[model samples]
Target: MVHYYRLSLKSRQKAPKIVNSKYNSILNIALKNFRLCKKHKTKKPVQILALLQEIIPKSYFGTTTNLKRFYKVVEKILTQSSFECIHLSVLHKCYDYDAIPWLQNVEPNLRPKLLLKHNLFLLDNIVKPIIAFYYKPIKTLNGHEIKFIRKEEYISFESKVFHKLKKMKYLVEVQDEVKPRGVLNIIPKQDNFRAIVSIFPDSARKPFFKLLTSKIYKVLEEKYKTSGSLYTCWSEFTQKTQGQIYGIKVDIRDAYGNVKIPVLCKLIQSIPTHLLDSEKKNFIVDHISNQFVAFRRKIYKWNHGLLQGDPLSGCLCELYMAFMDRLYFSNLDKDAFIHRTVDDYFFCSPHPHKVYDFELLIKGVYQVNPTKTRTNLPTHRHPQDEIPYCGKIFNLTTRQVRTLYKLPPNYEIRHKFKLWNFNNQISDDNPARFLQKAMDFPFICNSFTKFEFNTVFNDQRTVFANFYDAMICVAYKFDAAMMALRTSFLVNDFGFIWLVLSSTVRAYASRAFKKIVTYKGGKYRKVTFQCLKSIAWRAFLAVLKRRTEIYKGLIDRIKSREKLTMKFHDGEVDASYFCKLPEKFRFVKINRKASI
Candidate 1:
């Protein structure tokens, strides 16, 4: 009699010739065992078909149904794998439960484990490794090192779309016997869109500059009836002319208290939701989930984008403020002014009675939530006094009305006329002292001119190099900004040149100086040209060494940061990998920011 193991190996080897010679008897026994197992496992084809029919919905009985097709494909592969037979059998039972709910129940435990096993199996099945095998590392023939760009190339699409949209707003249309041609045809003849005016706060002065220009252009356009030019690119008027057109800017320096949260909540709730049907809602959920997953993966991969920066955050916050503005303020009549930028609220009206009504309306928005509100109660003694929205200080006193007409010491006004005292203001003359206190660096060790970089300071070499390189990259990327700063300061080498010189000086100062010689003018100078040459060479070497060390550290950090190591297991789900999963397969975890 033939052994089962030998026959099994022969079957796998595809040895038909050996089977015909001496393996026939051995093959028979092995085949008998396989047959027995198959027979025991096999159910009637008609019965299985009936089971499928009963399980799946009648509407989805078609062969092309995605659910049926996907299940069938999965059945063929997984049935042959080492996975549990019960789980395989349950695949047919998927139709018994609703798709979403069933998946939600099973996915938390099964999906990750299954995917992990599948990936491992695939790796084993592949004939050769398939990842980045042929591509060569980028190298320059010249000795120059590679340069990394900070910002991506400017996108022209935004400007194009914006211009088109603006043009569409004012284009006049007329009825014609024949269709209009080209650009004329596309131009809207009727004003179909309303101009949305919003005041948004930005910590960066750029937003205010842009906003003020846009407002002025809007006012001027209405007066002159000019239609072709872009409002954003308009040239700024002189300060004297600007003052004549717009009144003295309102100063709300201490504005921090009157956000009117209840009003905000109500306003957001009032947003139209007719388009948010079941299908559309589900799609949005899916989109958000997918975005989150993609974000996680990109973050793990050490990707940086505009959204990660502080200026972008300020812009987005302003956007949110704008959205609130549209709902609450934009709908108001011309007689009332309800617009606010951050905590600065403006109440303007030709009639004093209308201004009082406007204030009441604001109070109504605040009355919904009593806490975190500080509206000024009318002081009978000072009827003209205006309480800032932030409730920090009053603009008008009993005797005089305060306005941001002129810049004063310790005070600066935004483009909107909101005043703020510039805190943490330090002069460049003693920047080292200020920085030392700010960064909590040791006062004795961290001298302005002779800052130590070695063991005593315990400054991480990698961090220092990274900071330096990042600064260099910023200067390179924003050449215009650097040029402006240099020109403004009347210093040619103070920008990038200063950085290079500082690094060089530090590197050279590392060497031990033994002998010093007195020059004719009694100035003590270092001895020997050989020593000087050695110091210069060592300085260059130190720079290169530090750069290499930093780069190595960054590479390691990137790799570790990108690696997705946690495997999905039963009971508890790994939140870290939750974000890493494909959007279609991931769950939605909503994060709402609660007001403090």
Candidate 2:
């Protein structure tokens, strides 16, 4: 048995390396660490597993097969070393292995006490089962099982919308174009499925929802006069707090999925009766309450929480949660700061008792025990130990707030490449619109901080290369327009030059030009065109100075097939043009005689 195992190890060692060299290196390191732990004989299995987890790439654990492979490899090394083999699953059970470093090291006895202190409870018993119920397979109102729409069905539905709209006199003047089709996106998390409806079929209702949401926000703003939502509340809280304080972030279990219809209706009734005329208010409330969606030719009316895709759902959810916040604040200590964004609540106070009291108050309102609530308490007194609230992380100790980039694992690199692919499809004439669209790329702006945005442009060579290509595409269009004017009957007319410049081209130029230049150090820094390091700004400055130096330099580089290299604090990267230019577009020598 030993001989056979030795042979297997020998063969694996001698085998050609896999395509992913990084993954191979990581696997090797993990094996080395495991062997070292075995040799030491003093380290606990839980500790060794934590060490392995830190070294192991997050992408590898994304699949059960990969996790099994991880266990197999570790077991193999332990057997060969003649050490006691610890099962990975067992090790996982023994420790809080899935938790972040701060929580992972927490003493078992202290956790419950800390939770109670912070007004948090474990998701156990009834709460756990109730939350799980929402994620289970749901059926349509007619009792038929729900299913995703097929590609062909999606196309047919789109065609149906087009024909239906064409028949309506309201849309008679609207051009024939593909109407947006609703998509049902299902996200599977551990033990549960999150279903979201994207782009619902009733498009006209969207504007009304938005207007209603705005009015609701206005009412809340007038009443609170504190902070409207989580982001602003966090900013204000962090800025005001000075000393070490107990901070807690609590979340409602199945917040959106478990909203009670009766509770929601009662809450709506409590809205100021005088805000809108009674009839108008009743109409708006009725429309919201009776909201339904058509999916796969079946109607599904929301019986509990707001439909995830509806425009008004978020605002309605916030308004509903705000009532609870009002109750919480009414009884809260003067020094205690509590804010809610939808279902999540963030609170900080010098008196820990105040935090606990507020938690109980909210629990009574929701009829949930402490175990149903999940709370994250600060592990330490540093900004890094701060709990993520809304899109920012705040440390009450230092009163420091930092933007949290809640990007999914491997999503940053994946979306960066997708950005390149998208830039290739953008037109040169309207690059600004396309560039703005890039902000919505899944992981880019969603998780992007100003610091990280600059880092991508400076550190990630490919991102800058794609960005440069986009900018050049816009620049080429401008150059072409200038050439066309110079060669036309309007060459000598200043009015023609001014008129052409002031059109869409001018706006596009400003927007596209500023995107690259103003990717400066931080969010707080005012974006200025005077930054000398910005290549786009330099070119624009040259244009403003009426000197073709920057443009000529770019043209010379293009002609010589040289990439535009940008320098950063730590390193430099080549900003190469990967996008194809128009067939007729080429750098032409600027005629000195026809200077504007």
Candidate 3:
């Protein structure tokens, strides 16, 4: 019998190589870092100040000696996990952008977190998901084509007035802030980018109508839960299994692009707003109707469904979709409940043959545009005996669910850590960026805890195997990043980054595992959910504890340095600034508990 761990052929490609140290690059990067202290990008005042602190001192003055002292300081501070997250937050401000001209191209690829793949077509493919939205096919566009606008499309919030674009003009304050619209960002989901239009956060974001997003959700849910009559039906099937019923999951292509604007407006008017007077509702309707799209100073009217990342666009789509479910609810049998979210619908019925038929007639003909955006459907009933929704595989029979990690082809977390600390004023790419990569968020754990816990026990073996195996891949990916830094990292560096990640991973996975293992019993312990407490769980936990030990050992090393306490009086800019951390005196005075 072969008692050996197998190594995969992947995790070795596109791995970041330590480059830029080849002499042709010495002052090349340093000079760029200096000029960067002269400029700023983000509108935030504090963020701007942090940039000056990181870039100026390091770039113009860093010698071979200070560089080592700098990293030594980094190791000193971060070895303790408690300050590690704080350190990372400070560091990432450094990785923000480029420093010099004739230089950005030299090492343009270097950055924090991950860069994945790059190419014009690949980059565009990432943006195309949002680009596919136009409201033309009612629900059509490619995953799809994106681009160019000059029109201002308008629909009534309830038609209180008309837009005299020639007369009333625009908000003077809004125009400058509006530049954030359609700035495509590569926020990822393990593999490729998920498009998000950058909207500045509060307290700066208030001027653009602030478009108070949470208020509309009340009206949206009001229309959704009350109208569907599925209020009872939603709860109805919450318990009953699909044994007698046959089920198929149908996910909509671009749920947003298909939302009929007028229907959405109608849904909102049904629920009166603030003043409760007839005109009281007009204020918000104007905001929605006036929703505009921009490309630089250029503009387009939103005659379509919803914009991809609009604070308002998404819920409006959900609002229209809520009413569509039972537009013909009376036409179908009592078992013919359409359980759905904005993106997908799960249909199940004892009358198996009529399930898809019912879905097609009301959903297809009236709601979804058949030619477009009816993205996926099952020809065979419930393939793999699981109902897939929002990146998870759920079983109707077992009621247990597991996040199905769907990574893009050749997907591995890829990043280029800058070897030469040039300008761009980015403090330092936080080493913690790798931990909160967010690529792992939906898969490592989930948000709808109650729904997942109350519903189903996913196979512990499958959950643990996938959970552990992927991190192994991620660990190697991280090592590649460590290698790319072109500087030696201490045991402390490895300890802190891995600890944060492991702690984060365990926090969610343990919650999920507890929910997976515990459940209500049929007879004696029938009153409440109880843990099964099996051997496999004990075995899995053994590995979790071992990880904790390694992180703890790293902590012990840091503590030892602290114990042989000498009069450590070394102080400089005192920036506590991450191009260098300046908090050793504080470390000497107070003992901090491990935060991770």
Residue 90 in model 2: lDDT: 26
lDDT, residue 311, model 2: 70
Cα deviation at 482, candidate 3, in Å, is: 7.3
**lDDT, candidate 2, 270-356, per-residue tens:** 678765446656765775556454444544444446657767667767776666567657776657677766677777787666666
TM-score of 1: 0.19
Which sections of candidate 3 miss by over 4 Å?
A: 1-212, 226-239, 242-244, 273-280, 329-332, 366-384, 396-399, 414-448, 451-596
The best-first sequence of candidates by TM-score reads 3, 2, 1
Q: Can you tell me which runs of candidate 1 are displaced by over 4 Å?
A: 1-321, 335-338, 367-596
Highest-TM-score candidate:
3
TM of each candidate vs. truth? 0.19, 0.41, 0.47
Cα error, candidate 1, residue 463 (Å)? 46
lDDT per residue as tens, model 3, 316-396: 676666667656554556665566666766666656677657556546544443332221234543245566655556555
Every model's Cα RMSD, please? Answer: 28.1, 25.6, 18.5
What's the lDDT for candidate 3? Answer: 0.38
Candidate 2 residue-wise lDDT at 405:
34
What's the C-alpha lDDT at position 514 in model 2? Answer: 55
Residue 245 Cα positional deviation in candidate 1, in Å, after optimal superposition: 17
lDDT (C-alpha, whole model) for all candidates? 0.27, 0.42, 0.38
